[PDB]
Design a protein around this ligand. Structure first.
Ligand code: HEM
Length: 129
């Protein structure tokens, strides 16, 4: 929606915010020693991962459906099956996503709206242990 209601994308500040969110996420993943397990299973060059997550989040939050346009149906559990994701990879991903959100999305109510379903998805991507 845009006029009396608005989308989450609109609400958090749209493209500049999703850009900052996704950038800060991979930065924390690359620089925090506590995120080393999650970092270990990602590609040595994070550039392509960032592009895809940014496109995924853009569509997911009510912005333009750019991820689907390029890659088709998300099918995330299947796409994540190629990485070995145990509790550690899972909680370290959630560590970085939480901190990236807290730092880039000012509105607490919008962070709560986004977080609960993402944390559900993360537990659902876990494929080990
Ligand atoms: C358990 C937590 C998670 C871990 C450890 C994890 C890890 C990974 C890894 C290793 C990749 C492959 C990177 C690449 O191809 O460059 C990936 C891709 C991706 N992840 Fe996750 N992920 C997790 C949860 C999530 C969640 C909850 C979402 C959605 C909010 C998500 C969205 C994506 C997307 C859109 C891709 C690109 C898929 C594609 O290849 O088209 N991930 N993730």
């Amino acid at each position: 929606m845009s006029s009396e209601t608005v989308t989450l994308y609109e609400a958090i500040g749209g493209d500049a915010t999703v850009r900052a969110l996704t950038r800060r996420f991979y930065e924390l993943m690359d620089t925090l020693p506590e995120a080393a397990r999650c970092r270990a299973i990602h590609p040595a060059d994070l550039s392509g991962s960032e592009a895809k997550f940014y496109d995924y989040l853009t569509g997911y939050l009510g912005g333009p459906p750019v991820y689907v346009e390029k890659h088709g149906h998300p099918m995330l559990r299947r796409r994540h099956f190629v990485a070995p994701i145990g509790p550690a990879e899972r909680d370290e991903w959630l560590l970085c996503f939480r901190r990236a959100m807290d730092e880039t999305i000012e509105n607490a109510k919008l962070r709560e709206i986004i977080w609960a379903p993402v944390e559900r998805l993360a537990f659902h991507m876990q494929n080990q242990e």
